[PDB]
């Protein structure tokens, strides 16, 4: 027990305030540990309030705390533990199994507070990633190292294109992943659980290319603000300690947000624009800051993103847009007109999205499947009005293939054998160009429509066709 | 509610609305004279909300299949549905 | 203007499109209203002036569909009305 | 006949009904322009009072 | 005992008092300051302690001296109730505003009171009809039922309560409680000399009818506490006399506004879109001391004042909370020329049912409903286009429906002389007919403007007739 005993002198919420003795002064963003019969509460050091008075922030529950309660000082940034023992079970805020797969075996343990790379560290990208999936492959190539991003309304098939994500890409990866859930639901979590020791990536018979570390919606805002902080230690304890590459996954980064503006609140900084916390944007840097590729290792992020009534114009969505480099934007529309991808194809942008760097040939295409369907969209008005019959051969022989390519953007996913049960279709990069190319230049013109629509590649795009004939 | 889950007994709990809770905290928390929150609603609603939905489910086989189902109900005071609530 | 609007009685609301449009002052009768004020109405300026708020409210209604065709009464308030 | 009868009508209806549109616009312009300052002003006073306290 | 006290400040009429000796008037406690002016009454609302409570100052406190002795009466004022206020106008302290002098009282009452419990609760589903047609159709009354009307600026706000005094309350014979808070000075003389006229107010006589009226002028605090008076009268019939009563409260808006003013300086946090902290608690108490007990069942309606036609403002928003019935009046439907100003997509009642008012009721009900959405619908079609640019099934539809907007106007008759039309009032029974038979389209072969500003289907007919010539 630290002779850096402290008291607590105010319990007004999360902010506890506590009273370490004279001269006995923790540190800012340091750990202070409260025994309870309700294991030890973790209070991080956010000020001091000199006086001996520190102002710090719960972590755990603090009903039934008693004003004056004896607080021992762990005197550090809240050390979690990493290993290789992270591995396959679910590890909760305070670094406890919560799915009971026995105590984490830790090698070592660090600082959540861990800083970002300096530049000199950072090792420009170049890796094209290839998740398989038809609409990515082609219109938004994702990059190993990157920082996908998944924007799109609530959980509207988010938490599936997660799941079709893990399924392919992490699987086929022979390097860890990272996944973490901020404020999902546990029903969900329970979901997931057996979801991904049913595909094995968890073998509680053998290790797991995968760790989890969920923290749900039912802990206090503060917990959810560093549930994050958590996950990211350990993927940085991969990248560097281990030296592997992996692919982080967060889910869902509004919650974030949403958890460091409400505790800014609490802590009293005048709020700032639609009521974020004015330390928003540090928040948000410091996380996307720590992931990077290193010459020490690549760290592909995906972080789900809630857009609050689907307004990327809210400044949260916006400040997000700014920080991350793989942009996806998943509109209802989309899904309602039943297509899964969900995602808005000219809204889809990324970093490695380019021209010689994605190939002439892809580029030249998808700069035709750009121009074909934001013609469709300028035609819809007119369609809309005027009426269809008021259109050019040119235009209608657009509108046929539009319709098409936006059927054949379909792409048929194994999570959505718990939807249709239709099984999953995956089709590798350098098929779905070659495929593109051909729609585009009219060779499946004689294919109908209904036959891209939820079928994959051109060969089931082709029996689809011969199906529907007969 | 947890009375019939732990029975492991299913069962429904309609929380009609939750606005009106809302309401009942911002008034709790100004006169408590904490700083007004995110469109006068107390920062912590979000712990306050999700940890009373967390509370509803359909548990293990272990837990006798405790099926307490939530229905929260927020009536739309204007249709906004980006305000806070 | 509500709060003011709930204590008085009736309005003088002027329209500036008619300000513009010659009639100087330009009293608009659409939101000129006047809650108890008729028992000023001094008795042959009631006599005379029997219905011309309900013929002036004529001219506007008949004036908002005048904006096609018009049967011969119809536009005979019309021409009275704008007169 | 008919149809240089037909033709002209749509010409003078299509005509009739950009005037329309355009005093929808200014109507929507005026709620518009309205509907901002609103916005302002009570964004405005949710940070002074917070700031306030 | 003879609580002295000084008072240690005058900010606004929230007076500060600082009691000399130790003891404590409990909150809602009153006291008085014998003002060069008569009296002042104050009223508890916080102990801050050492002493010093803070007190809200019903009437005004111009001439102040900081530092002016003050002597605690205790508890909340007594107001005078009995059956001898039935013709009184009563001012908030209990003294008549009408001058009649001393009220003759046996009991006098203290304002604070309790709502009554759940589980005396006796509720309603009596029938009463207004004989007004859109109310008629749209949103049936019940005796003992809270109606309430959400119209803009007084804008025949008092006309249509007028109407409703003139119908309903001839037709009851229960008392009947006119509370008029924040309201002119002038209405309150219409009213007074309307009543008397009226004969509501037997003078010789003893009238049937009681009044409590608050002038705008009064000062904030004094209209906050205009409400509990009158609640306190409702009580005395509703409970202690028993008899069935009716209730009229208008404008209870200012109930709300008043609250926020105080709210700032009583030293609250005046959060809620400015409004009190305390509005959704104060509106609560307000409107279930407005109750249906296993005694007395008081026909209210109260009137909200849309603050500058923001009905998403959170005060009207939780008015609609605390009411069974409403009757929400649009500017926009007066612009129409329709009045009564009535909404007819803006009106709910819980009495509307196919098993309430029967099934032939509901069910002309939801055709002329959907028949308006319809027409609103297409009010930006008819606009962009024209009504021959949209189909000829929908145009009949949209005839009908600008038939039936018109229909609706039915002349008041109170305001029959600022209409000038003679007013006209239909039967219940009546007017199910006279709009089913439109909707079977029968006088759809005779003009809109024979269904402007006319009652009964018989006066359509009638009116063709002189449209005719």
Redesign the interface.
Not at chain 2, 33 to 40: D, K, L, N, S, T
């Given at each position: 027990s630290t002779p850096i005993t402290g008291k607590v002198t105010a319990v007004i919420g999360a902010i506890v305030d506590v009273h370490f003795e004279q001269s006995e002064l923790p540190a800012i963003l340091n750990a202070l540990e409260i025994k309870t019969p309700q294991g030890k509460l973790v209070l991080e050091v956010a000020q001091h309030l000199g006086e001996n008075t520190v102002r710090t922030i719960a972590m755990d529950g603090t009903e039934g705390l008693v004003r004056g309660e004896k607080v021992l000082d762990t005197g550090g940034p809240i050390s979690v533990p990493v290993g290789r023992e992270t591995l396959g079970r679910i590890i909760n805020v305070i670094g406890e199994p919560i799915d009971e797969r026995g105590p984490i075996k830790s090698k070592l343990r660090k600082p959540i507070h861990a800083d970002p790379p300096s530049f000199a560290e950072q090792s420009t990208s170049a890796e094209i990633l290839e998740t398989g999936i038809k609409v990515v492959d082609l219109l938004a190539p994702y990059a190993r190292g990157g920082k996908i991003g998944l924007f799109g309304g609530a959980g509207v098939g988010k938490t599936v294109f997660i799941q079709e994500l893990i399924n392919n890409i992490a699987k086929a990866h022979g390097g860890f992943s990272v996944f973490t859930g901020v404020g999902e639901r546990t029903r969900e979590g329970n979901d997931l659980y057996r979801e991904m020791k049913e595909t094995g990536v968890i073998n509680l018979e053998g290790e797991s290319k995968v760790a989890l570390v969920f923290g749900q919606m039912n802990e206090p805002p503060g917990a959810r603000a560093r549930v994050a902080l958590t996950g990211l230690t350990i993927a940085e304890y991969f990248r560097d300690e281990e030296g592997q590459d992996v692919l982080l996954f967060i889910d869902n980064i509004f919650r974030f947000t949403q958890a460091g503006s409400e505790v800014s609140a609490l802590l009293g900084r005048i709020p700032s624009a639609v009521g974020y916390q004015p330390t928003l944007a540090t928040d948000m840097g410091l996380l996307q800051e720590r992931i990077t590729t290193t010459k020490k290792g690549s760290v592909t992020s995906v972080q789900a993103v809630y857009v609050p009534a689907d307004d990327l114009t809210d400044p949260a969505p916006a400040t997000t847009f700014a920080h991350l480099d793989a942009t996806t934007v998943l509109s209802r529309g989309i899904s309602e007109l039943g297509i899964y991808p969900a995602v808005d194809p000219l809204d889809s942008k990324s970093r490695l999205l380019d021209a010689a760097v994605v190939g002439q040939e892809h580029y030249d295409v998808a700069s035709k499947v750009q121009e074909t369907l934001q013609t469709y969209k300028s035609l819809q008005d007119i369609i809309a009005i005027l009426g269809m019959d008021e259109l050019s051969e040119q235009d209608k022989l657009t509108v046929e293939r539009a319709r098409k390519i936006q059927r054949f953007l379909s792409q048929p996913f194994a999570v959505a054998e718990v939807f249709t049960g239709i099984p999953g279709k995956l089709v590798r990069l350098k098929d779905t160009v070659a495929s593109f190319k051909a729609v585009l230049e009219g060779k499946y013109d004689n294919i109908p429509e209904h036959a891209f629509y939820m079928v994959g590649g051109i060969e089931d795009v082709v029996a689809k066709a011969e199906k529907l004939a007969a | 509610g947890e009375w019939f889950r732990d029975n492991g007994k299913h069962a429904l709990i309609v929380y009609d609305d939750l606005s009106?809770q809302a309401?009942?905290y911002?008034?709790l928390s100004?006169?408590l004279?904490?700083?007004?929150?995110?469109?006068?609603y107390?920062?912590?609603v979000?712990?306050l909300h999700?940890?009373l939905?967390?509370?509803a489910?359909?548990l293990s086989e272990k837990e006798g299949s405790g099926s307490l189902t939530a229905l929260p109900v927020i009536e739309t005071?204007?249709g906004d549905?980006?305000a806070?609530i | 203007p509500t709060n003011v609007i709930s204590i008085t009685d009736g309005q003088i609301f002027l329209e500036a499109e008619l300000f513009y449009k010659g009639i100087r002052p330009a009293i608009n009768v659409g939101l000129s209203v006047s809650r108890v004020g008729s028992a000023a109405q001094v008795k042959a300026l009631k006599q005379v002036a029997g219905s011309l708020k309900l013929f002036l409210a004529q001219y506007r209604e008949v004036a908002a569909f005048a904006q096609s065709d018009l049967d011969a009464s119809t536009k005979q308030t019309l021409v009275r009305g704008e007169r | 006949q008919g149809y240089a009868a037909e033709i002209s009508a749509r010409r003078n209806a299509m005509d009739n009904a950009s005037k329309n549109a355009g005093d929808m616009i200014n109507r929507y312009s005026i709620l518009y322009n309205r509907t901002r300052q609103a916005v302002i002003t009570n964004e405005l006073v949710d940070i002074i009072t917070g700031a306030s306290s």
């Open positions: - | 009106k309401v009942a911002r008034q100004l006169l004279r904490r700083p007004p929150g995110r469109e006068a107390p920062g912590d979000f712990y999700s940890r939905l967390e509370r489910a359909k005071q204007g549905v980006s806070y | - | -």
